Amino acid sequence: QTEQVSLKKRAESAAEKKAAFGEDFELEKYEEGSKVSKPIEDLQSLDEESKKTLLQVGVIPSEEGRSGSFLVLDNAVSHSTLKDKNVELMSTHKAMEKYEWLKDYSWKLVQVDADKYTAKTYLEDADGYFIRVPAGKKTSMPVQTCLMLGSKKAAQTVHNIIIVEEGATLDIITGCTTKKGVEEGLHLGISEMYIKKGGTLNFTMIHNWAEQIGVRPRTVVSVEEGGTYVSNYICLKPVRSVQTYPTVRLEGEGAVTRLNTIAIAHPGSELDLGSKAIFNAPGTRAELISRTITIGGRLIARGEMIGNAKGAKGHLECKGLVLTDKGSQLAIPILEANVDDIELTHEAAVGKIAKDQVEYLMARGLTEDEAVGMIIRGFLDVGIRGIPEELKEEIENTIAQTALGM
Amino acid sequence: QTEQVSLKKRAESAAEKKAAFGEDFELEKYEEGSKVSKPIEDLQSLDEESKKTLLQVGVIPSEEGRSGSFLVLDNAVSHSTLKDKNVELMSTHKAMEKYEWLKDYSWKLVQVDADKYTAKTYLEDADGYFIRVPAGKKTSMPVQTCLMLGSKKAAQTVHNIIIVEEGATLDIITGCTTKKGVEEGLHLGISEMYIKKGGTLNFTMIHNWAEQIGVRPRTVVSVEEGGTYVSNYICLKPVRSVQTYPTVRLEGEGAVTRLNTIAIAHPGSELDLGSKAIFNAPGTRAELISRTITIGGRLIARGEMIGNAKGAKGHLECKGLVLTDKGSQLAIPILEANVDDIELTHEAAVGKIAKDQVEYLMARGLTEDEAVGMIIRGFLDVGIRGIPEELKEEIENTIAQTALGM
């Protein structure tokens, strides 16, 4: 009651608080997306159009090779099912109502007043998914989630909470996409992820938006002793603006994270993509890998490694190709060592594709576009090593078709 | 004429304009340093303390191995002589009185309204040195300049202009220091350097301030076709705050710059040291090397490479050791590719000295302090390759004594 009043106050105070990076959106220009959503008990019953849409972001209507499925359309949960008995999957609202302790995890890692986007999401009483793997259990197959914009020009506000209990493993694939014909809109998605002692969370996220969509995810991950967080973000399709900067706090001894990004910046697009790792306990490790290409958009690769404990080791690699006469690549690392006994290293490279590699492949009988296709496939593949195998084919198709359209 | 009124208006409007980085100084707290000083005709008639002070920052009262000398005490030129009649050396005030055309170079590369420090420097009608090396001519020995703070808590404001004409070469050594017993003060030093087609400017700068001194250099270098700018900055002694971020514009085909920094951040020190290279013509080249150590201060390595022209290649390396339990190392360099046909690369490393290397040297009979000494000599030497040989012995002494006092 006092807590709720104090959070509402803080969130109201942040209504005009711009995010540090990315285009500033006037939230009043977007209608809040529908909080009523017609349930869909069986995803196989959907239209061919919506099924292909799901498939393009790695969401399988048949749930073949999936442990469960969660679907949000605009601001309401449309589907929530499980095949696996060692996972708990519920709407965030329903989880808050079931578990009185869940309030100890809600709006703790992500602050309600971080920026106007977190504030709006809090104030809208955002629903989302709650996913928990109890102690010692491992998901047999990935749980899939899908966040979908269905209205003309609305704001989607989502709040997810993931808890991986001691010694547990959770695999998740999230696809974010749009109804056919949806061109404008905002996605504000707050995710708070808790990995307890010896837990593991593998999280693959594929985005397919539209030319005038703004995207503002805010994600904070807390990794306890001997925990592991692996993230792979894939953003290969046109979109007006994405600005995402997940923070992973390595809180316990030997906590590790591997954070991966692949992206293609299209004309008229700003992609401001970052990763932050905070080394707060001895022996913590991070590998941050970004492989991106611009074909006319603006790409900013941010990476931040904050060394607060002895024995920590962190490495950031950012590479960004510029393929066209329009567009730009920026690499903006931050390495901060606040103790003596630490190793933080980084390499960055931006600019041209290798002319000799293109010419070598053309001599083998390939057009320039085909040659570029093969090179960029190899280049981007480094950033998606070890994603679920099943996802590679569609991703490769997207990369190939991009090269061949140049 | 109308121009002077414009610049004054601009400078006045920026009187309160904080610099983007570094501690903000209240300019009102510093009395402007004396604009009068007794002429010192013979440097060797200087008192032995003053001569020691000069020698500590690489300035030779005897002028052996030197082409000329320029000395500023507080805000007044105290000495200006040349051994040879090729180079032109005069105070900035006297050059501005002599040459109507110098108005085309003065306050052009550095804007009067960049920040409150450039503004103050403009408004105080700062003096300094003007050097011109006539077309095709070369210094046979480096010119030496020295800037000295001599009052209890004064603001020093200097404005220097260097013009290296077509095919010419200038070697310069600058030492910046304080009179004995001087502990507080502010140094504001604006330098505008022009390198014409085929010209070369080799510039070495050694700083030795005091524990409560703030230092705000603003330097812009303009490098024409086939020109070369080499900079070596050395900052090994206690100082409250240094914030410097020279910009080098590579304006003509094949212009090259090599920018080097070595530093040691002492307790209670902030060192915010950057280099910016802008590639504005094809075939332009930059190599930016920074090697620094904290023994309790805060060290920030800034670097920026902006690629605006096809065929450019730039490389930044920054390494920063943290040797003590207090202190921090931050590496924040920036790569920006604005064209496709370009190569920008960088590597950054912050954190520990190599434990195995310390242990190896200790086993050979050395104390920990001696072993650290040998390692940091090797580590910092990378950033002072190519400085005039004569300066190395004193610098190595400083590095050695620092390790040995730990």
**Secondary structure (DSSP) of B346-360:** EEEEEE---HHHHHH
- Give the integer Cα–Cα distance in Å for A145 and B61: 76
Burial of A146 (0-12, 13-18, 19+ CB in 10 A): buried
Who contacts B225 (Cβ-Cβ below 8 Å, separation ≥6)?
A: B197, B198, B251, B252, B253, B254, B255, B281
Whole-angstrom Cα distance, residue A63 to residue A83? 9
Residues with Cβ within 8 Å of residue B359, at least 6 apart in sequence: B371
Contact A241, A267 (CB under 8 A): no
Beta carbons of A351 and B307 less than 8 Å apart: yes
Cα of A343 vs its chain's centroid, Å: 27
What is the C-alpha R_g of chain B? Answer: 21
Cβ neighbourhood burial of A253 (10 Å; 0-12, 13-18, 19+): middle
- Residue A344 to chain B, least CA–CA distance (Å): 5
Residue span of the structural domain in which B390 resides: 1-405
CB atoms within 10 A of CB A348: 26
Is there a contact between B335 and A330 if contact means CB atoms under 8 Å apart?
yes
Among residues A152, A158, A142, A182, the alpha carbon closest in space to that of A78 is found at A158
Contact by Cβ (8 Å): B13, B113: yes
Q: Where are the alpha helices (DSSP H) in B48-102?
A: 48-56, 92-98
Report how far residue B176's alpha carbon sits from residue A291's, in angstroms, rounded to the nearest whole number: 44
Chain B's closest residue to A347, CA to CA, is: B347
How many residues are there in chain B?
406
Cα R_g (chain A), whole angstroms: 21
**In this structure, are residues B57 and B149 in contact, taking their beta carbons and an 8 Å threshold?**
no
Q: What are the residues facing A317 on neighbouring strands? A: A289, A347
CB atoms within 10 A of CB A344: 29
Q: Look at the block and give the residue holding tokens 């197959």.
A: A141
Q: How far apart are CA B86 and CA B71, in angstroms?
A: 20
Across the A/B interface, how many CB contacts are shorter than 8 Å?
111
For residue B153, which amino acid is it? K
C-alpha span between A315 and A343 (Å, rounded):
8
Q: Quickly list H helices, A85-141.
A: 92-98, 116-123
Give the span between the Cα atoms of B286 and A42, in whole angstroms.
Answer: 60
Give the chain B residue whose CA is nearest to the CA of A303: B332
Preferred mutation among A344, A347, A358 to probe B, highest tally of B CBs within 10 A? A344
Angle, vertex CA A331, rays to CA A232 and CA B260, nearest 5 = 140
d(CA B200, CA B197) in angstroms, rounded, equals: 9
Resolution in A: 1.6
Structure tokens at B67: 């082409």
Count the Cβ atoms, other than its own, within 10 Å of residue A184.
Answer: 18
Residues A113, A10: contact at Cβ < 8 Å?
yes
Burial class (CB in 10 A: 0-12, 13-18, 19+), A81: middle
Q: HSE on the CB side for B240, CA within 13 Å? A: 15
Amino acid at A369: D
Using the structure block, give the residue that is written with the tokens 């009523």: A36
Query: Would an 8 Å CB–CB cutoff place A102 in contact with chain B?
Result: no
- Write out the two tokens for B275: 């280099």
Is the alpha carbon torsion for B155, B327, B288, B373 positive or negative?
positive
Measured between alpha carbons, how far is B199 from B176 in angstroms, rounded to an integer?
26
CA-nearest residue of chain B to A308? B328
Q: Are B80 and B90 in contact (CB under 8 A)?
A: yes
A311: left (phi over 0), alpha (psi -120 to 50) or beta: left
Give per-residue burial for B103-132: e unless 16+ CB within 10 Å, then b.
Answer: eebbbebbbbbbbbbbbbbbbbebbbbbbb
Structure tokens belonging to residue A67: 């442990």
Q: Total domain count for chain A? A: 1
B23 secondary structure, DSSP code: P
DSSP 8-state secondary structure symbol assigned to residue A310: T
Residue A336's closest CA among B227, B294, B404?
A: B294
Report the alpha-carbon distance of residue B332 to residue B346 in Å, rounded.
Answer: 11
Nearest-Cα distance to chain A for B350, in Å, is: 5
Neighbours of B401 (CB within 10 A): 11
| Per-residue tokens: B282 | 């094809």
Are B216 and B177 a contacting pair, CB within 8 Å?
no
Q: Using CA atoms, how far apart are residues A195 and A162, in angstroms rounded to an integer? A: 8
- All residues of chain A having their beta carbon less than 8 Å from the beta carbon of residue B342 are 322, 350-352
Strands A143-149 and A169-178: parallel
Cα separations in angstroms, B118 against A378, A383, B93, B163, B219: 49, 45, 17, 20, 10
A262 Cβ contact list (under 8 Å, min separation 6): A232, A233, A234, A235, A236, A290, A291, A292, A380, A383, A384
Greatest extent of chain A over all pairs of C-alpha atoms, in Å: 72
d(CA A370, CA A362): 8
- Rounded Cα gap, residues A280 and A248, in angstroms: 10
Based on DSSP, count helices (H) and strands (E) in chain A, helices before strands. Answer: 7, 21
The shortest C-alpha distance from A106 to chain B (Å) reads 33
Which residues are within 8 A (CB) of B401 and not within 5 positions of it... i.e. 6 or more apart?
none
Gap between the Cα atoms of A82 and A90, Å rounded? 10
Angstrom distance (rounded) from CA B25 to CA B30: 9
How many C-alpha atoms does A197 have within 13 Å on its Cβ side?
2
Residues in chain A: 406
- The pair of structure tokens assigned to B36 is 């009068």
The Cα angle at residue A85 between residues A83 and A87, in degrees rounded to 5:
90
Who contacts B181 (Cβ-Cβ below 8 Å, separation ≥6)?
none
Residues 6+ apart with CB under 8 A from A122: A7, A8, A11, A107, A112, A159
Give residues with Cβ within 8 angstroms of A9, minimum separation 6: none
Would you tell me how many other CB atoms lie within 10 Å of the CB of residue A335? 28
In B179-327, DSSP assigns E strands to 184-195, 200-207, 212-223, 228-235, 241-244, 247-250, 256-265, 270-279, 285-294, 298-307, 312-322
CB contact under 8 A, A346 and B341: no
Q: Which of B355, B276, B285 is nearest to B314 (CA)?
A: B285
Exposed/middle/buried for residue A36 (C-beta within 10 Å: 0-12, 13-18, 19+): exposed
The residues with which B164 forms a beta bridge, in sequence order, are: B133, B195
Q: Which of A190, A258, A189, A188 is nearest to A223 (CA)?
A: A258
Tokens at B221, concatenated? 């270098």
Q: What are phi and psi of A368, to 5 degrees?
A: -55, -45
Nearest to A11 by CA among A188, A273, A244, A162: A188
Return d(Cα A365, Cα A72) in angstroms, integer: 47
3-class DSSP assignment, residue B39: coil
Q: Looking at this protein, which amino acid is placed at residue B385?
A: R
Buried b / exposed e across B196-230, counting CB within 10 Å, b at 16+?
A: bbbbbbbbbbbbbbbebbbbbbbbbbbbbbbbbbb
**Local structure of residue B295 (DSSP, 8 states):** S
Closest to A91 in 3D by CA, of A123, A59, A68? A68
Q: How far is residue B344 from each of residues A15, A103, A351, B201, B275, measured CA to CA in Å? A: 40, 48, 6, 24, 15
